[PDB]
Amino acid sequence: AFRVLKPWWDVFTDYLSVAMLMIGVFGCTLQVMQDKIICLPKRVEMKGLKTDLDLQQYSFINQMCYERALHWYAKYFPYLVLIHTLVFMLCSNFWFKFPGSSSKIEHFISILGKCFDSPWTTRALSEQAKALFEKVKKFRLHVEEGDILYAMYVRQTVLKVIKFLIIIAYNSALVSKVQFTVDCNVDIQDMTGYKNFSCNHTMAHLFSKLSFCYLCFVSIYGLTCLYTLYWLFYRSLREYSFEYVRQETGIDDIPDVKNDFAFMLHMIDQYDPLYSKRFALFLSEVSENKLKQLNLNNEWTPDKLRQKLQTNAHNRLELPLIMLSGLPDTVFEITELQSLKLEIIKNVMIPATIAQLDNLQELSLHQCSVKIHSAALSFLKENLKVLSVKFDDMRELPPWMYGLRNLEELYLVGSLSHRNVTLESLRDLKSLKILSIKSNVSKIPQAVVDVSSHLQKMCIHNDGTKLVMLNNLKKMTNLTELELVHCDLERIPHAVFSLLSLQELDLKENNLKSIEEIVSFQHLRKLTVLKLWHNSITYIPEHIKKLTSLERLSFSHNKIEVLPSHLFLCNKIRYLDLSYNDIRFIPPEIGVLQSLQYFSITCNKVESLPDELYFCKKLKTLKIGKNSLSVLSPKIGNLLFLSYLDVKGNHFEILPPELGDCRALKRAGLVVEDALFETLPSDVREQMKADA
Amino acid sequence: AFRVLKPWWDVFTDYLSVAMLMIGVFGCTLQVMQDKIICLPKRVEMKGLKTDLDLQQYSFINQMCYERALHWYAKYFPYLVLIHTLVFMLCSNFWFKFPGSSSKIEHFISILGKCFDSPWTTRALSEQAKALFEKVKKFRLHVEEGDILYAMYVRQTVLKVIKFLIIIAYNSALVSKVQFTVDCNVDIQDMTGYKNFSCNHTMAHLFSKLSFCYLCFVSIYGLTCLYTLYWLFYRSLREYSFEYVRQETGIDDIPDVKNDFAFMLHMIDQYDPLYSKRFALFLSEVSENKLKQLNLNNEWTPDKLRQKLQTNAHNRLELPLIMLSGLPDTVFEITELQSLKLEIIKNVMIPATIAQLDNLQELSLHQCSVKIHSAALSFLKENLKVLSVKFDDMRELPPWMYGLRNLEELYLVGSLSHRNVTLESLRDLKSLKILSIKSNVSKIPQAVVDVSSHLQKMCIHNDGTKLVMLNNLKKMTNLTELELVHCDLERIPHAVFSLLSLQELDLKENNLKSIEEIVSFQHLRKLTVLKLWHNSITYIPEHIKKLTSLERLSFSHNKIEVLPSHLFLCNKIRYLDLSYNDIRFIPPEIGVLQSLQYFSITCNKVESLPDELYFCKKLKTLKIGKNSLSVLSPKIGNLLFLSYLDVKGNHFEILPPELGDCRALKRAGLVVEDALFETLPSDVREQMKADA
């Protein structure tokens, strides 16, 4: 901030100014020492020329004639040179004495010094520099808006030039004016009796010679200004192009700088090019990317990663990654985890280092625009078996995943149709077995036809975008598991029966009130599972009783109030859930479904419990829900296998000790009011809460 | 920081300049104080000669004849001294007062101080200085672009010489110009009534003496200059070579220097040779390597190595080396390890220190360009038995391995055809018995036949390149086990029938469909094992019944849909895997191959069991897999040897307790769904899972 700021010509001018200051102080010192004029009255074997005057009269004449005849330049030359030298020095150093410019220049000097002081600069050219990067960009944004410093420096140069010109111009004339002798014709006569006087003062001749050499100095000074002025109109210093660091280091960033930034770069280059070389990289963005990589690698230890390792949803060892700028290399040192999820980590590319991570089959990507390596791609196609993608606008969507073959589980989160899904061909997915979609697609894409030959499980849950077109749905014959959530069809589309190998069915949130297409379900006697979530059924078909293979039945959230007992002809069912309906009564013939093991009718107005319900002793989970049931029958002892019971919200007053016979049911599986449990005697409550 | 910069001649000149300044200020001070000329009017028993002129006219005459007749050199001599002295001072100091050169000089000073201060220099000539090596090399690369220092210093000496010469030139003439007495005839008559005057000034003779003494100093100054000038134009300092440190310390590095480097080093020697002596070492690359090795061994300790020591794939005590640039010596202090692996370690040469490590039979090189010591080479040839090589572009492949003799197992990782497999003569390997290749080669290279005279196992696993030519393969008389994995054969190559000693065969991922050459394979009566992984063979010709020696059958991911019964005409088989195929049911002939011990039909379409399956008790491990089975027969109690059972993915509802018959089978071997497992009784499940 005090030494590196000066180009060579500036140093030359500074030393010249010092020399001028020395000249001026020397002249002033000599003047105050011996500036004496001697005077005699002019008009008048040779002999004396006695003037019969006292000394004091001579002193008076000296003073008066000194004031009168001797030119003022001769008298004041030392002060003049001293002040003009001082004006040079002040005009030179106002470049830093001005606080507005001073702050900018000082902050630049500090940042550049810390920049070339960084050994990380050398390492990149071959840590804490990261903090210096933000200061670099802060300075570049804050100060590039300036260039006033350049203009006012130009002003300083111009004023130095013009002041040099004026000094030379007028001194060239005044130098001749001084003289050794002098002749003053002053009317002190008749008070001293003399009118004409010859005089001379000591310094005159010396000053002449002195001033002579002084002029030379000034000339030299002016020359330097010209050079600088040439340098000021020969470089167009409002812009600098590196064009060699970008050439040599090959980094195509660091294109250019602003005007004052070009100014400071050229100045420091005049001082030394190497500082410009060192200062250039901190502006490179790739350098900061590599530094971020280094910092995360230092911070992310394999121990730290193993701290965050947990189990995924699908029983695998997985590493959470919620916010990163890239891939820590230490991650590749942990190959044992079978799953991996990365969330909101943009602009990433997986190297061949994934080849280390062989013991992996599951990968997850929540809004991460990530690409691959070729060896990484081969490793994926040969090793990855499960993939989850939460994309938003297909910006995260990579094409190369369509080349994957060994994948068998796939989950899609992110709207596609937004109204035809812009889905690429699902050809290479040769080992695919599970497909999941969470989008707003209106028609089944063609690309699914590309994989259905071996697919087994699929999952579509649109946000209400009704699947208007069903052609490819009729092709999904090899498909074996199907569930529809909020597909908004309101009925059973004919394509449903197009698939025979299906065993599990759902029409969740599809508002089903009359589902009497059961006739073509008599074409599908393999339907083991039938879900009807969030539907509209107050009207149960009879034809369902013709189906034999039914094992688990769902009719959650519907509006039927009386269930026709002939529906009990599907005697193979085990899991039954008519919850959130308007049912009120239970027919006795409900005893004929001995295979039933699960029962749940929550949020319904069921009122009667026929002991025949106890007859299906396989029932282990009975969930009446909030109801109006008042009596607990003894035949609950018939349910020695009852593992769960949900009676919350009923009219049981005192619970008989019958629950003592129910070993399989304990305090956990019991859902009743605590007052109800209070009426239970000691033995039942003891065998229930503990082993007694 | 500045003393070292000054050889004797420059110090002497500085002293002389200081003496010049003292003389000059002496002269100016006395000129101001005492230097007054006295004057009298010249032309006029003896008596007094009263001139009746008061003090005033005497002062005036004094000044006038001071200026007029007294010579100008006499008056200006002290100021001449001052100007010349200050010019010498300025010129001498300008060498370090020019910023561009001075920055390099300061960086030179810093690096010289740090390098001389390093005690590791003494240690080498007898830690963190490795951080000084990069500073040394950056200094050398930067300052090898100068030579301005030499020219600048030469110009300074030249200007000093010319100033000396001109000083002598005119002072010799003008010294005698001064005179004690002086005469002046000035038209001051009618001013003081006199024209002719005699005068003299006190300092006159003094100046003479003074001048002489001053000139004396000047003279020697020039001599000093001449010395340097001769010393500057008699050695050609533009190039320096040590030629002593290279000879004394016996290191052929540190060859030469740049021109300005030469000049700097010459100046240092003139000041002090041993400073440059101690600087010389940080310039050695050998010394840099030695200090890097020393600090690496400071970081590397045998305990750290033994922490990493583990067991390899071939159950050997092995040291994983993942990121290194050299060979830690503590490694050579650990001999108990039986294997060694090195990954990504370039530019390393193994010393004879492995002679300390006799207990080695396995070695590995994962992308490591490695050279040897001759004694190390002999130790390897006599000691190594196993080696794994991972290479990318063969640059890491050191051919001296082809000379090894006693190795038993070798592994190759990388392409070779690049389309002749890049192989050298495999004749020097006198003990190879097992070979493994991972490449993209289409033809068997000749040189393998050179080791086929004693090679016992050959394993080639290309990445899909078709094994087009097999002429050399047929010559492998000693070959016993052949593997052709992923060779894209699509048909049986004839060369296999040319290998009589064949016992174990693999055809993984060759996608064969027609295998009617079994009769040709009938020539090989020793076909112990045959693999058909991932082939396209829809069905099996009956000819395979004629190979009794068949013991293991693999049909993973093949196109078989119906299995002919004649396969069960070879009861010598123990291993039988036809999983991932299209079989719907099993003929009861599976009951006649009693020797079967392993069975796997996962991902097939079996739906019922020929109870003759319960007749072959030797089947210890059963893998039904995810197929369409629905019931499990109690006859499973026959095969008590059965220890593993994989039925998951079937349509079972209740598991019979007869699985508790097979004590070998337990919950570990029992691959069942938890709901299916619950169907077992409490006693049976407790016996399976634990000791109940």
Side-chain angles (χ1 to χ4, degrees), chain B residues 270-285:
Chain B
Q270 301 325 301
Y271 168 76
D272 168 87
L274 58 90
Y275 285 169
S276 55
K277 176 71 61 64
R278 291 199 168 265
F279 203 80
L281 169 139
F282 264 6
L283 208 66
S284 178
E285 61 86 19

Short mmCIF file of all heavy atoms in Angstrom, two decimals, chain B residues 270-285:
data_model
loop_
_atom_site.label_atom_id
_atom_site.label_comp_id
_atom_site.label_asym_id
_atom_site.label_seq_id
_atom_site.Cartn_x
_atom_site.Cartn_y
_atom_site.Cartn_z
N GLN B 270 31.17 -13.52 -4.55
CA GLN B 270 32.08 -12.43 -4.23
C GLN B 270 31.83 -11.92 -2.81
O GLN B 270 32.77 -11.55 -2.11
CB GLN B 270 31.94 -11.29 -5.24
CG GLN B 270 32.23 -11.72 -6.66
CD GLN B 270 33.32 -12.76 -6.76
OE1 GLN B 270 34.45 -12.53 -6.33
NE2 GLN B 270 32.99 -13.92 -7.31
N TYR B 271 30.57 -11.89 -2.39
CA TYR B 271 30.30 -11.61 -0.98
C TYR B 271 30.66 -12.80 -0.11
O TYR B 271 31.50 -12.69 0.80
CB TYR B 271 28.83 -11.24 -0.79
CG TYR B 271 28.44 -11.21 0.67
CD1 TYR B 271 28.81 -10.15 1.49
CD2 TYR B 271 27.73 -12.25 1.23
CE1 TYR B 271 28.47 -10.13 2.82
CE2 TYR B 271 27.39 -12.25 2.57
CZ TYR B 271 27.76 -11.18 3.36
OH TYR B 271 27.41 -11.17 4.69
N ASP B 272 30.05 -13.96 -0.36
CA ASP B 272 30.31 -15.16 0.42
C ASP B 272 29.98 -16.41 -0.38
O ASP B 272 28.80 -16.66 -0.68
CB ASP B 272 29.50 -15.14 1.71
CG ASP B 272 29.50 -16.47 2.42
OD1 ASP B 272 30.43 -16.71 3.21
OD2 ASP B 272 28.58 -17.27 2.17
N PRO B 273 30.98 -17.22 -0.74
CA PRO B 273 30.70 -18.42 -1.54
C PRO B 273 29.80 -19.44 -0.85
O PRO B 273 29.01 -20.10 -1.54
CB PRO B 273 32.10 -19.00 -1.80
CG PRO B 273 33.04 -17.87 -1.56
CD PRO B 273 32.41 -17.05 -0.48
N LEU B 274 29.89 -19.59 0.47
CA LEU B 274 29.15 -20.66 1.13
C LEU B 274 27.65 -20.41 1.20
O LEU B 274 26.88 -21.36 1.33
CB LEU B 274 29.71 -20.91 2.54
CG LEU B 274 29.75 -19.79 3.57
CD1 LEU B 274 28.47 -19.74 4.40
CD2 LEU B 274 30.97 -19.93 4.48
N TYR B 275 27.21 -19.15 1.09
CA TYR B 275 25.78 -18.90 0.97
C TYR B 275 25.22 -19.52 -0.30
O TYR B 275 24.21 -20.23 -0.25
CB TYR B 275 25.50 -17.40 1.01
CG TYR B 275 25.63 -16.78 2.38
CD1 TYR B 275 25.63 -15.41 2.55
CD2 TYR B 275 25.74 -17.58 3.51
CE1 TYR B 275 25.74 -14.85 3.81
CE2 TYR B 275 25.85 -17.03 4.76
CZ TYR B 275 25.85 -15.66 4.91
OH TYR B 275 25.96 -15.11 6.17
N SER B 276 25.87 -19.27 -1.44
CA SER B 276 25.46 -19.93 -2.67
C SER B 276 25.68 -21.43 -2.59
O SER B 276 24.93 -22.21 -3.18
CB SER B 276 26.23 -19.34 -3.86
OG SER B 276 27.63 -19.42 -3.65
N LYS B 277 26.70 -21.85 -1.85
CA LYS B 277 26.93 -23.28 -1.62
C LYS B 277 25.70 -23.93 -1.00
O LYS B 277 25.22 -24.96 -1.48
CB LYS B 277 28.15 -23.47 -0.72
CG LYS B 277 28.44 -24.90 -0.34
CD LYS B 277 28.95 -25.67 -1.54
CE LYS B 277 30.23 -25.06 -2.05
NZ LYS B 277 31.34 -25.15 -1.06
N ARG B 278 25.17 -23.33 0.07
CA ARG B 278 24.02 -23.91 0.74
C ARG B 278 22.74 -23.69 -0.06
O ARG B 278 21.80 -24.49 0.04
CB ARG B 278 23.88 -23.33 2.15
CG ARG B 278 25.00 -23.78 3.08
CD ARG B 278 24.62 -23.59 4.54
NE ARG B 278 25.55 -24.27 5.43
CZ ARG B 278 25.36 -25.48 5.92
NH1 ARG B 278 24.29 -26.19 5.61
NH2 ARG B 278 26.27 -26.00 6.74
N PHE B 279 22.68 -22.63 -0.86
CA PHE B 279 21.55 -22.47 -1.77
C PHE B 279 21.52 -23.54 -2.85
O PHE B 279 20.45 -23.90 -3.33
CB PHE B 279 21.57 -21.09 -2.42
CG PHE B 279 20.22 -20.65 -2.91
CD1 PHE B 279 19.28 -20.12 -2.05
CD2 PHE B 279 19.90 -20.76 -4.26
CE1 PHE B 279 18.05 -19.72 -2.50
CE2 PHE B 279 18.66 -20.35 -4.72
CZ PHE B 279 17.74 -19.83 -3.84
N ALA B 280 22.71 -23.95 -3.30
CA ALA B 280 22.79 -24.90 -4.43
C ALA B 280 21.94 -26.14 -4.21
O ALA B 280 21.30 -26.62 -5.16
CB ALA B 280 24.24 -25.30 -4.61
N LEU B 281 21.92 -26.66 -2.98
CA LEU B 281 21.24 -27.96 -2.75
C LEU B 281 19.74 -27.92 -3.04
O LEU B 281 19.24 -28.89 -3.64
CB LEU B 281 21.54 -28.33 -1.30
CG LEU B 281 20.75 -29.51 -0.73
CD1 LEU B 281 21.62 -30.41 0.12
CD2 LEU B 281 19.66 -28.90 0.10
N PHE B 282 19.03 -26.86 -2.65
CA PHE B 282 17.55 -26.91 -2.84
C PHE B 282 17.25 -26.99 -4.33
O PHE B 282 16.08 -27.23 -4.70
CB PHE B 282 16.84 -25.73 -2.18
CG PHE B 282 16.33 -26.06 -0.78
CD1 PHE B 282 16.62 -27.28 -0.19
CD2 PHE B 282 15.55 -25.16 -0.07
CE1 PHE B 282 16.16 -27.59 1.07
CE2 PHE B 282 15.10 -25.47 1.20
CZ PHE B 282 15.40 -26.68 1.77
N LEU B 283 18.27 -26.82 -5.16
CA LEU B 283 18.08 -26.89 -6.60
C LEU B 283 18.20 -28.32 -7.11
O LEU B 283 17.85 -28.59 -8.26
CB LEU B 283 19.07 -25.98 -7.31
CG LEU B 283 18.58 -25.46 -8.66
CD1 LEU B 283 17.39 -24.53 -8.45
CD2 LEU B 283 19.68 -24.74 -9.41
N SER B 284 18.69 -29.23 -6.28
CA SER B 284 18.79 -30.63 -6.67
C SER B 284 17.43 -31.30 -6.63
O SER B 284 16.71 -31.22 -5.63
CB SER B 284 19.76 -31.37 -5.75
OG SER B 284 19.85 -32.74 -6.10
N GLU B 285 17.08 -31.98 -7.72
CA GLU B 285 15.84 -32.76 -7.72
C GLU B 285 16.01 -34.04 -6.92
O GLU B 285 15.05 -34.54 -6.32
CB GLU B 285 15.40 -33.05 -9.16
CG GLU B 285 16.38 -33.85 -10.00
CD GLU B 285 16.21 -35.34 -9.82
OE1 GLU B 285 15.13 -35.76 -9.35
OE2 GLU B 285 17.14 -36.09 -10.18
#
